[PDB]
């Protein structure tokens, strides 16, 4: 008869654990019952949106498996993710190909 809250909310992300983490991190004396749900959803939506673009980036480089380069390409080419992660370093990500035009011959 047990029914996991993640299941009740239709999420992959562990609503239960997210509840535990809000508590034992001391953000407030008490936590509302809807807060871990909403939070677990947003976490899930953001990992979904990123993996979407990173998967696209692996296929365009004929790879099955996502690697940190694909995370980096997906992130730095998406205007909004790039803002969200403007001060984040992705280990083994590299940079986006860019040569100032002033530097090319012709």
């Amino acid at each position: 008869k047990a029914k996991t809250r993640s299941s009740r909310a239709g999420l992959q992300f562990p609503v239960g654990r997210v509840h535990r983490l809000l508590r034992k991190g001391n953000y407030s004396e008490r936590v509302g019952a809807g807060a871990p749900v909403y939070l677990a959803a947003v976490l899930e939506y953001l990992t979904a949106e990123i993996l979407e673009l990173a998967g696209n980036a692996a296929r365009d480089n004929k790879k099955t498996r996502i690697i940190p380069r694909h995370l980096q390409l997906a992130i730095r080419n998406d205007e909004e993710l790039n803002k969200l992660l403007g001060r984040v370093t992705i280990a083994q990500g590299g940079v986006l190909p860019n040569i100032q035009a002033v530097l090319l011959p012709k």
Binding site: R69, A91, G94, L103, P105
Partner: protein, 99 residues
């Protein structure tokens, strides 16, 4: 008869080479050596988790690769193609670092 690339051509190939890649660019033993020297000046007989030196190396290389983008814009703003210390200096100060 002997073949020669005009100066700048090999540079542009390298820029393309290394922007396409994600390998670490500083050699790994000398960097580790540098880190243990520095860390040992703050506290003696420390040990390092491997992942900690690699974290430090990734962080460093990321920092410098990016400072070089900013330095490069500074040389260009001054109608040059060559980076010089004043470009790094200008960049570091606008950024909010110093000395």
């Amino acid at each position: 008869k002997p073949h020669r690339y005009r100066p700048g051509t090999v540079a542009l190939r390298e820029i393309r080479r290394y922007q396409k890649s994600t390998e670490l660019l500083i050699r790994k033993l000398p960097f580790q050596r540098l880190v243990r020297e520095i860390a040992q000046d703050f506290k003696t007989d420390l040990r390092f988790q491997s992942s900690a030196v690699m974290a430090l190396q990734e962080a460093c290389e990321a920092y410098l690769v990016g400072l070089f983008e900013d330095t490069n814009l500074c040389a260009i703003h001054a109608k040059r193609v060559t980076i010089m210390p004043k470009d790094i200096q200008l960049a570091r100060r606008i950024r909010g670092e110093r000395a």
